[PDB]
Amino acid sequence: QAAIDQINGKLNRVIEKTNEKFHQIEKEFSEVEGRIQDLEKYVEDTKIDLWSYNAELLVALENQHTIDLTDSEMNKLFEKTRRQLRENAEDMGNGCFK
Amino acid sequence: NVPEKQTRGLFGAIAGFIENGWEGMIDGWYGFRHQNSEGTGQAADLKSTQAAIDQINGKLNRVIEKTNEKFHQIEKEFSEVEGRIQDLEKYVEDTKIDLWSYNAELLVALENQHTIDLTDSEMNKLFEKTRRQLRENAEDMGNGCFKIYHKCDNACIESIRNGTYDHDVYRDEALNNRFQ
Amino acid sequence: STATLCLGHHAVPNGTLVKTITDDQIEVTNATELVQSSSTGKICNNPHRILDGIDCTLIDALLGDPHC
Amino acid sequence: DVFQNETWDLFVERSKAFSNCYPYDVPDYASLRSLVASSGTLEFITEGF
Ligand SMILES: *[C@@H]1O[C@H](CO)[C@@H](O)[C@H](O)[C@H]1NC(C)=O
Ligand SMILES: *[C@@H]1O[C@H](CO)[C@@H](O)[C@H](O)[C@H]1NC(C)=O
Ligand SMILES: *[C@@H]1O[C@H](CO)[C@@H](O)[C@H](O)[C@H]1NC(C)=O
Numbered sequence: 001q002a003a004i005d006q007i008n009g010k011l012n013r014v015i016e017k018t019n020e021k022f023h024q025i026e027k028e029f030s031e032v033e034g035r036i037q038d039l040e041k042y043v044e045d046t047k048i049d050l051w052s053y054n055a056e057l058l059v060a061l062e063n064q065h066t067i068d069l070t071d072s073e074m075n076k077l078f079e080k081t082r083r084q085l086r087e088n089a090e091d092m093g094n095g096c097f098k
Numbered sequence: 099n100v101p102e103k104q105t106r107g108l109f110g111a112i113a114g115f116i117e118n119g120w121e122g123m124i125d126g127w128y129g130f131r132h133q134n135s136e137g138t139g140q141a142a143d144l145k146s147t148q149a150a151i152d153q154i155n156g157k158l159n160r161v162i163e164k165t166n167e168k169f170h171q172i173e174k175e176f177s178e179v180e181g182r183i184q185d186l187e188k189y190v191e192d193t194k195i196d197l198w199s200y201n202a203e204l205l206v207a208l209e210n211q212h213t214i215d216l217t218d219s220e221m222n223k224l225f226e227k228t229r230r231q232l233r234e235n236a237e238d239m240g241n242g243c244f245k246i247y248h249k250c251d252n253a254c255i256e257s258i259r260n261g262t263y264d265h266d267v268y269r270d271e272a273l274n275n276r277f278q
Numbered sequence: 279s280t281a282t283l284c285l286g287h288h289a290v291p292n293g294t295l296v297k298t299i300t301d302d303q304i305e306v307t308n309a310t311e312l313v314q315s316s317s318t319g320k321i322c323n324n325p326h327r328i329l330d331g332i333d334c335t336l337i338d339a340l341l342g343d344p345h346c
Numbered sequence: 347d348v349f350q351n352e353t354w355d356l357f358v359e360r361s362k363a364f365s366n367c368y369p370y371d372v373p374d375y376a377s378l379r380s381l382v383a384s385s386g387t388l389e390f391i392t393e394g395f
């Protein structure tokens with residue numbers, strides 16, 4: 001439950017608060033106009049590249065921390081079981097207590 | 099933060115652990131509470147406290163230092179309707195604002211996550227170091243406590259806390275009490 | 279018969295909630311605000327040389343409006 | 347003329363659209379198009395010129 005709660009929480013953080021945009025610059029052009037059109041194209045391309053990089057980095061970080069926290073939960077459970085088996089048991093090294 | 103007002107599980111007889119924080123210390127972030135034949139006591143660990151505080155202040159300085167300086171900029175508020183150029187300026191500023199807001203959100207989230215992680219790591223490191231100092235004289239309780247099987251007086255506790263503790267000179271009696 | 283040595287960390291009666299990658303709301307003992315959401319309400323005149331255009335737009339001063 | 351006094355949250359222009367009246371050109375066509383679209387209405391009030 002703890003791991004699932006953390007995973008769903010990070011998913012909700014990722015997806016919630018969608019940006020709302022109504023009126024924007026023109027991004028497709030049927031003409032050749034030069035300075036202003038090139039500036040608009042450059043602005044949109046810069047935004048797209050920056051947001052693509054942000055998405056890539058965010059997904060990589062979230063996946064890395066998801067794996068790390070799941071492994072940490074597993075190790076925490078093992079450690080807690082080991083400390084419950086104060087001396088009655090002996091660790092096998094393969095994830096098992098005798 | 100894990101407060102511990104109401105003894106959270108037991109009466110005053112047997113208390114103190116890692117699962118719950120302590121509000122009764124102000125001299126350090128990390129520390130020890132001990133019971134023995136000489137009585138009861140509490141102290142703080144300056145090393146881990148200083149290391150954690152140094153890391154926290156360092157990341158804060160990284161976050162705040164090197165403020166960007168900007169003097170002349172596009173117009174961002176308009177009293178007219180002009181169309182293409184004004185819409186382009188508005189879009190540029192809105193894009194910058196959204197990107198920087200996302201950057202701030204992500205940075206704060208990452209910094210808080212790593213702050214909590216490194217503080218917990220410092221606590222676990224201190225516990226591990228104490229456990230390895232108590233090579234065999236002691237036995238881990240699972241609640242963040244070690245039971246010492248010999249007469250670990252206040253000098254003994256001080257040696258454990260400051261690192262001069264010697265396990266061998268208590269080893270024989272500790273093992274005998276453990277197994278017999 | 280034996281001694282007991284417990285290791286722990288400081289806590290506060292009521293901390294502050296913060297966001298993280300994992301937990302949307304987690305308490306910490308101490309936190310700082312990183313957003314300056316309030317203003318003095320006045321424009322300090324230093325170190326920048328502030329020039330107050332009381333009744334004049336910059337263009338009026340440029341052209342030489344009589345009241346500028 | 348079917349679009350008189352119309353209002354919208356999103357005006358959708360079709361590639362097949364054409365002009366069938368006097369030939370005209372709008373200097374800064376994009377600016378007028380954008381500001382009319384942002385206005386969101388073609389509500390026209392006649393005035394006694
Ligand atoms: C550590 O504590 C022991 C026990 O009191 C003491 O003999 C020793 O001098 C202490 N060492 C330091 C560096 O304070
Ligand atoms: C801290 O105060 C807030 C106030 O809303 C609260 O709801 C929360 O339960 C408090 N925590 C403690 C430990 O007092
Ligand atoms: C909280 O942190 C700030 C910034 O480091 C510091 O100035 C302040 O004294 C701290 N407060 C407490 C109660 O630790």
Ligand SMILES: *[C@@H]1O[C@H](CO)[C@@H](O)[C@H](O)[C@H]1NC(C)=O
Nearest residue numbers: 350351352388389390391392
């Ligand atoms: C459009 O609406 C205006 C009122 O805003 C009205 O005066 C005018 O007659 C209307 N035109 C048509 C064609 O309905």
